Amino acid sequence: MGKSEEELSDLFRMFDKNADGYIDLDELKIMLQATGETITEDDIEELMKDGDKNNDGRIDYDEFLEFMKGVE
Ligand SMILES: Oc1ccc(/C=C/c2cc(O)cc(O)c2)cc1
Numbered sequence: 687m688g689k690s691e692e693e694l695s696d697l698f699r700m701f702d703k704n705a706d707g708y709i710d711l712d713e714l715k716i717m718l719q720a721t722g723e724t725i726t727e728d729d730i731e732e733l734m735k736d737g738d739k740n741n742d743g744r745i746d747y748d749e750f751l752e753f754m755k756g757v758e
């Protein structure tokens with residue numbers, strides 16, 4: 687996990703490559719590419735499951751908090 691919502695905020699606002707307020711599946715798979723992201727298509731949805739348990743296709747800061755517990 688990060689430190690608190692001070693650093694967590696930038697991980698959400700500065701990571702949205704689409705620029706709309708909510709991170710989507712396309713930006714998540716393109717964000718971890720700098721630190722790894724070398725897996726199959728199911729692994730892309732692995733993090734999306736905890737970030738978006740509804741699977742609607744959009745991640746908000748409220749759901750971002752719930753994901754930090756699964757991604758650690
Ligand atoms: O919906 C998501 C929200 C956040 C993340 C972040 C993952 C992650 C994990 C790390 O150890 C370092 C990092 O810079 C990013 C992945 C999916």
Ligand SMILES: [Ca+2]
Binds near residue numbers: 713
């Ligand atoms: Ca987005």
Ligand SMILES: [Ca+2]
Binds near residue numbers: 739742744746
């Ligand atoms: Ca969602």
